């Protein structure tokens, strides 16, 4: 078998909304997609995530008011293909990058979805 990096869960909400978490090797989420009316979106929402995941600059680098350092990854529809969660330090904001970088590079999706 090939070396895995991490794995994303696609799992609806409540609001029946499609939503992938991409979790790192020890299970700990990195990044987490906005709430898609459609699994169409969320399947784009990881095919961009994972052409971006390279791509530094398009991740959006900012700090909350709460003193709190995450970034938002962009796409061309300025649409959020994954919010990071917000971390304390700038430096383990700086390690998110690297590591939605690793495991962005995969494609392992967990279907969570068919909760009813």
């Known amino acids: 078998g090939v070396i895995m990096a991490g794995w994303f869960e696609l799992s609806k909400s409540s609001d029946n909304q499609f939503r992938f978490v991409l979790k790192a090797g020890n299970g700990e989420t990195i ?3 906005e ?6 979106s969320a399947e784009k929402g990881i095919a961009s995530v994972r052409s ?14 709460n003193g709190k350092f995450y970034f938002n990854l962009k796409a ?5 293909i994954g919010s ?13 990058i ?6 962005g590079t995969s494609q ?3 279907d969570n979805t068919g909760s009813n």
């Open 98 to 103: 690297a590591s939605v970088k690793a495991n």
């Open 31 to 33: 990044l987490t997609s």
């Open 35 to 40: 709430l898609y009316t459609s699994k169409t």
């Open 76 to 80: 061309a529809n300025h649409q959020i």
């Open 108 to 110: 392992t999706v967990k």
């Open 84 to 96: 990071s969660q917000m971390y304390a330090t700038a430096q383990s904001r700086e390690t998110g």
């Open 52 to 65: 971006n995941s390279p791509q530094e600059e398009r991740y959006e680098k900012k700090t909350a008011s």
